[PDB]
Amino acid sequence: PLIEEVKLAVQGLIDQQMDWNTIEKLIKSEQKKGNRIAQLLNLPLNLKQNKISVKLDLSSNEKINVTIDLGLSAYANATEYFNIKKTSAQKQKKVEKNVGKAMK
Amino acid sequence: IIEPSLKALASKYNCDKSVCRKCYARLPPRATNCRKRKCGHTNQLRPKKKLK
Amino acid sequence: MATRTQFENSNEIGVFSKLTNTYCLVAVGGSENFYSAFEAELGDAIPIVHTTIAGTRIIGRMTAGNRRGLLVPTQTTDQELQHLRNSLPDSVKIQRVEERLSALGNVICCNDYVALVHPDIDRETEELISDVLGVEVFRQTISGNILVGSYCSLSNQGGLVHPQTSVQDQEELSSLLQVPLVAGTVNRGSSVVGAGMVVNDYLAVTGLDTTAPELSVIESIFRLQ
Amino acid sequence: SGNGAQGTKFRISLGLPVGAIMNCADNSGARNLYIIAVKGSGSRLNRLPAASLGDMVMATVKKGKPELRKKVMPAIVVRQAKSWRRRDGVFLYFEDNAGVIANPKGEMKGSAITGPVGKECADLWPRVASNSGVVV
Amino acid sequence: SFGGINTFQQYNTDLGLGHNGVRISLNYFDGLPDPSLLNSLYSNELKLIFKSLLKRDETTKEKALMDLSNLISDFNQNEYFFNDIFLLCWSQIYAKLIISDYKVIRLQSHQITIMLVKSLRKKISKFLKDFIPLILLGTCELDYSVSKPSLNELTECFNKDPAKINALWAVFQEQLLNLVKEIVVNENEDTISDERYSSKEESEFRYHRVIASAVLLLIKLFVHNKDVSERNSSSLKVILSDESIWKLLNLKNGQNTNAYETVLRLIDVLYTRGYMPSHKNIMKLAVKKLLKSLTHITSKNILKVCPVLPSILNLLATLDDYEDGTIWSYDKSSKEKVLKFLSVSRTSPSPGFFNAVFALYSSTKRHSFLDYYLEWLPFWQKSVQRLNEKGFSARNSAEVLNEFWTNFLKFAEDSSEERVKKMVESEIFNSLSCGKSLSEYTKLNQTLSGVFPPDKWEREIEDYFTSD
RNA sequence: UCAUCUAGACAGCCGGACGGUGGCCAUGGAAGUCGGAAUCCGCUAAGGAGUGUGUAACAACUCACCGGCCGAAUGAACUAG
RNA sequence: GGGCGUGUGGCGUAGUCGAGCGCGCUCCCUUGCAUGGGAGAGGUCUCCGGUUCGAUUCCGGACUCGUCCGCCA
Numbered sequence A: 001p002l003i004e005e006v007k008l009a010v011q012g013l014i015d016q017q018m019d020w021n022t023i024e025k026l027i028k029s030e031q032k033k034g035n036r037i038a039q040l041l042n043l044p045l046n047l048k049q050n051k052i053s054v055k056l057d058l059s060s061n062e063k064i065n066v067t068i069d070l071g072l073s074a075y076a077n078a079t080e081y082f083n084i085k086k087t088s089a090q091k092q093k094k095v096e097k098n099v100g101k102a103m104k
Numbered sequence B: 001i002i003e004p005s006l007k008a009l010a011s012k013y014n015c016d017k018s019v020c021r022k023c024y025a026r027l028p029p030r031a032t033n034c035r036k037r038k039c040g041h042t043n044q045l046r047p048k049k050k051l052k
Numbered sequence C: 001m002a003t004r005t006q007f008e009n010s011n012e013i014g015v016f017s018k019l020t021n022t023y024c025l026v027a028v029g030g031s032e033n034f035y036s037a038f039e040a041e042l043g044d045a046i047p048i049v050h051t052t053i054a055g056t057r058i059i060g061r062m063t064a065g066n067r068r069g070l071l072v073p074t075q076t077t078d079q080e081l082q083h084l085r086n087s088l089p090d091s092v093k094i095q096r097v098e099e100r101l102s103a104l105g106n107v108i109c110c111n112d113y114v115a116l117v118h119p120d121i122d123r124e125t126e127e128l129i130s131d132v133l134g135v136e137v138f139r140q141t142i143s144g145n146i147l148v149g150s151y152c153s154l155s156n157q158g159g160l161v162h163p164q165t166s167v168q169d170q171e172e173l174s175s176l177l178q179v180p181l182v183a184g185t186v187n188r189g190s191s192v193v194g195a196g197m198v199v200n201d202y203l204a205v206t207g208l209d210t211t212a213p214e215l216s217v218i219e220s221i222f223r224l225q
Numbered sequence D: 001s002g003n004g005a006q007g008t009k010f011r012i013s014l015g016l017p018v019g020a021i022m023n024c025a026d027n028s029g030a031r032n033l034y035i036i037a038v039k040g041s042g043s044r045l046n047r048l049p050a051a052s053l054g055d056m057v058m059a060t061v062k063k064g065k066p067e068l069r070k071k072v073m074p075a076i077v078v079r080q081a082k083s084w085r086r087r088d089g090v091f092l093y094f095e096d097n098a099g100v101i102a103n104p105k106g107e108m109k110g111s112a113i114t115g116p117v118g119k120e121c122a123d124l125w126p127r128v129a130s131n132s133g134v135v136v
Numbered sequence E: 001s002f003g004g005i006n007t008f009q010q011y012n013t014d015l016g017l018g019h020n021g022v023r024i025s026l027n028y029f030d031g032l033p034d035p036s037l038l039n040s041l042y043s044n045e046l047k048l049i050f051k052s053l054l055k056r057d058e059t060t061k062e063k064a065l066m067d068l069s070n071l072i073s074d075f076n077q078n079e080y081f082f083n084d085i086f087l088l089c090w091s092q093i094y095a096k097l098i099i100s101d102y103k104v105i106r107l108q109s110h111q112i113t114i115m116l117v118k119s120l121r122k123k124i125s126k127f128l129k130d131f132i133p134l135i136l137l138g139t140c141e142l143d144y145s146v147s148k149p150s151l152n153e154l155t156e157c158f159n160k161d162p163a164k165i166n167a168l169w170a171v172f173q174e175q176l177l178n179l180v181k182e183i184v185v186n187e188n189e190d191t192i193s194d195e196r197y198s199s200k201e202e203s204e205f206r207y208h209r210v211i212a213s214a215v216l217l218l219i220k221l222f223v224h225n226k227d228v229s230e231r232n233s234s235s236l237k238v239i240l241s242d243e244s245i246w247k248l249l250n251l252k253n254g255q256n257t258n259a260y261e262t263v264l265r266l267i268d269v270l271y272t273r274g275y276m277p278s279h280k281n282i283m284k285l286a287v288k289k290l291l292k293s294l295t296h297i298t299s300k301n302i303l304k305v306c307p308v309l310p311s312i313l314n315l316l317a318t319l320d321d322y323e324d325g326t327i328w329s330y331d332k333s334s335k336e337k338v339l340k341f342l343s344v345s346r347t348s349p350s351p352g353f354f355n356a357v358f359a360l361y362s363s364t365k366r367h368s369f370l371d372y373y374l375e376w377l378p379f380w381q382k383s384v385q386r387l388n389e390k391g392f393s394a395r396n397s398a399e400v401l402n403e404f405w406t407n408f409l410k411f412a413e414d415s416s417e418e419r420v421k422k423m424v425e426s427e428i429f430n431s432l433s434c435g436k437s438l439s440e441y442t443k444l445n446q447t448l449s450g451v452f453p454p455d456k457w458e459r460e461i462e463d464y465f466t467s468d
Numbered sequence F: 001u002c003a004u005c006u007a008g009a010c011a012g013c014c015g016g017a018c019g020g021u022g023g024c025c026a027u028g029g030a031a032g033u034c035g036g037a038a039u040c041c042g043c044u045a046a047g048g049a050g051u052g053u054g055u056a057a058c059a060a061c062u063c064a065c066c067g068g069c070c071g072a073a074u075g076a077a078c079u080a081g
Numbered sequence G: 001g002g003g004c005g006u007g008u009g010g011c012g013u014a015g016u017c018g019a020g021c022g023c024g025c026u027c028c029c030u031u032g033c034a035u036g037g038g039a040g041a042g043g044u045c046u047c048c049g050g051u052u053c054g055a056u057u058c059c060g061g062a063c064u065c066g067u068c069c070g071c072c073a
C-alpha cells in the first residue's frame, strides 16, 4: 500500500505537466524537510521509461532499491519480478541438460 | 485536460471510427464493408489507431 | 534594468533606436513589444519619437544624440526634420551635418560631457559637434577600431568598450573620458556593443540573446541599480 | 537573401551574374570575392543567376589569404556599379562592385567596411550597417 | 482544464508564509497553485492569465500581468471575478513573482497587489496577513526604483496616514519576522533559482540580493518595535545563527557594497540593542567576518570599496569599545589585518575617511591596540605624504587633504612629542610649497592657518621676501 | 447444405443468467476466464466445471441460455448469372 | 549499375561450434665483420541480430575490399 501511495504522489505531480527536474528538486527538498513519501524515493528518476525506484527495508536498517513501473500496479510489478525469476529457472534447467554432453 | 465526458464526446466523432485497409477511408465503428466504390466495398477494415 | 527587446527578430537595439536622457527615438517599422518596452520603461516623462532618418529604418547609426542637441545627416529630408522639430522639446537643438562620413552614430560615441569621434572627421564637423552638443571632443580609436560609436557604449556613469581591447588603451580611454570602462560582450558574444544596445542614466535596452553575465556587467558598469 | 533578411527589398536592377568578381570591402584579409550563386534566385533555362545590391551570395576568395581561399562562404553585396532606380526615381551607381563576408545568419566575418555602402543594403542587414562607415 | 493534485504538499501540512491555508513559498519547485483551485477560478479569462504567469518566458509573463492589471482597473465590472479563490491563488504566485529577476515584473506585481487591496479594502483582511509582509519587502528593497514607488503607493492605499504605515509594522511584526526567517534559513540560493537555466554565479548573486532586502527589512522592524527582540528571541536566535547573513559581508567580490553596508548597519543595531551582547557567540561570528572583510579590502579593489570604508571604521570604533577592544582580542591577526588595511586604505583616501580613522584612533589609544609613534603617527605621515603627491589634481582630493590636516593636527595634539610637532611643521611648509590655490580652497586655508602661527606667517612673509 | 419457426423464430429494449464448487493437477498467486487434463449433477423456464472485459488472487461487468413487449420468417457456410 | 568472393594482435598468418604461431618491440641474460637465448605485451576474430548451451565457426542484414561483365552511332 505505501508503494501505491508513492506512485499516486508521483503520478499526481506528473499529471500537473510539471518539469521532471523541478519534480526531482521537489523530492530533494521534501527529503530535507523530512517527508516520508519523499524519503522512500531514490533520486535518479527514470521518468523517460515511466519507472521510479523505491527503498524498502530488508528486515521488518538495510534498505534495497526496487524499480517500479508507474503504469502497472505494485502487485503487477511484483508479478513481473516473479516472472523474471521463473524465466531464469528454465534457462538453468536447459544448462543442466547441456552439462553432460557439453563436458563430454 | 478537456473533461472526461467532453473527451468522450469529442472522441465519439474523432477517434471511435474504423479505417478501410484498402483505401484509408474513415468509416463507422460497427461497419462491415467500406462505403467507397474504389476499393470495391471491401470488408478489410481495422480499428482506428488510438493513443496511449 | 537591461531590458530584453528585439526589433522584429533583431537583437541589435542600438541600430534601430537612439536613447538619451531627455528623449528617445525609435524606428517607424517596429513591433508592439519593441514600442511597449520603451513606453513602459521610459514612462510619460520622456518623449519617444517614431522617426525615419534619410529614408532608413536605421536611426541609431545614422544620428548622434545628446541631451542638449541632436545631429542628423545631410540626406535627412525636410519632412523628417520638421517632424523631429515639432516632436522634440524646445531645449534640444537639431542641426544637419554636411560631412562625408555621414553615419553619425557609427562615427561619434558621445555622452553628456565628453565625446569620442572618428579620427578623420572634418574640423568644421568637430566644431559643429562642440557647438551644438556643448561637448569636448577627442579623436581616438578603440584598439584600432575607427568606428567608436559602433564599438563603444557610453553613458555618464560608465562605459562598455570592445572585448578585444588592449588594457593600456583601457586606462588611456578611461583617464581621457573620466569614466570607468569595462571590456565586455553583448548579444551572446557579438563584438559590436554600441550597435548592440542603448543606455542612459537609468535605462539600458539590449537584445534578447544577451546573457545573464553580460547583463550583470551592463548594470554594474552603468550603475542602473 | 533569404533567411537573415530584416524586412523585404524592392527590386534592384541585377548587375552581378555568376562568375563576377567583386572587391572585398571588409578587413578580413580577402581581396576579391567570386560569385558562384545567388540566394533566392529563380529558375529559367539558360538564365544566369544574377545579384544586386543587398543580396546575399555564395562566393569564393580567388585572391587573398590561404585560409580564406579554396572554400565557399556567404557574402553580401554592398556596392553595385550598375545603375538602378529608387522609388524616388534617382538613378544611382557606385564605381565598383564590392561585397563583404558573412555567415548564413548575416553577421560579418570582418569588423570594418571601407568605402560607401548602399542604404538598401544597410537597411536590410544591421551588422553591415553597424560596421559601415558611410551609408548612401 | 486544470489537472493533477498536490499530494506532496498535503503530506507536509505546512502553510509556509500563508495563513489562509495555502503554502506560499519563494522557491520555484513548490507553492505553485493547486490545479483544483485553479479550476475553481471564476472566469476563463482569469484562468488563462494564471497559466501564462506559470510559463517561464518573460514576455508572456509580462503580457499576462498587464492583462491582469487592466481587469483590476475595471473593478466594478470584474468584482465578481476577484474572489477568495483568486486571492488564494494570487498570493501563491505573488511570492514567486517578487523574486523575479526582471524589474518590471516585480514592480507590476507590487502595483497590482496594492491596487487590489485599495479596491477590496476591508474585504482582504483574512488575506492581509500573507500580503503585507510581501508588500513591505517590496517597499524595502535595495533598488530605489522598485522601493520608492511601492512606498508611495502603499501610503495612498492607507489614505496617506503615516500612523497606519507604522501600525502595519507593529501589527504584522510576527508575520514580517517569519518572512525574514524564511528567506534567511529556510531558503538557499539554489532553491531560489533553477540551476539549469542559471549559473552557479548569478544564483549566488540573487540569493544575496534577496537576503539583503531581508536584512533591510529587519532593521526597519527593529526600529519600529522595541520589544520585537524580546518577543521574537527564539526565532531571532535562529536567524542570527545561520551563516547566510554573515556570508553577505564579502567585499572580495560582488557588484554592490550596498549590500555590505546594510549588514554593518544590522550589526551596529544589534550591539546598540544589546542583542549582540545577549548572544556573544553571534557577535563573535560577526566579528570574525569583519576581520575577513579587512583582508578582502585590497589595493586592486580600493577604488571600488572606497565609499564603504569610512563607515567600516566608524563601526569598528564602536564595536572595539565593547569589551576592551574585545573585538580586536578575538583575532590574533587583527592587528596584522589592520596594518595591511591601513596601507591599502592610505593609498586611496575617501572624503571623510580620515575623520573616521581619527575616531578609530581615539578608541585605539585607550585600549592601546596600536602603537602610536611607530605605527599610527608614521602611517598618517605616509598618508599625508601620499596626499601631498595627490595635491589637488582631482576634485575633492583638495577637501580630503584639508580634512587630513585637521585630523593630523588632532593626531599631533595627542602625540605630545617634540619630534612629532617638528615633523608636522615640515609637512605643513612642504604642502604649501608643493602648491595649490589658497584662494580656491579658501575655507581650507582658514582651517590651514593653525599650522603656521599668525605671527609666524608674518615672519614667514619676511622669509619669503628674502627667498630668491 | 445445415439449422430455428404462430407451442412465438432473427433485430431492438427490460429482467434473471444460480448452487455442489475456491470441481482435479500445477503456481507466490490464479476461485469460469496463465495453462494441463476431464467437463458431471442439482434447481430449473434457464444458466458453460465458461464468451469476453476483468483483479496479485478476488470482487465487479458482460456474454450463450431462459423469460415480458413485438407477431412472422430468419441465421450461418457455400455455389454461379 | 549488377554478379561473385573477401575481412585475425602493431604486421603476416592457422582456424572441423568447445584464437596458435612467426615478425615488430617490453625486460633480462649474452656477443670484433653485434648476435643469439629466456620469460613479455599485443585481438571486442569488420559490425549488428537470431540459433545453440556457446558461435571465428551456423544463418540473415549492413559496411569494407578485391575480381568479372556492362552506352551510342
Ligand SMILES: [Mg+2]
Pocket: D045, D046
Ligand atoms: Mg543551355
Ligand SMILES: [Zn+2]
Pocket: B020, B021, B022, B023, B024, B025, B034, B035, B036, B039, B041, B042
Ligand atoms: Zn475502402
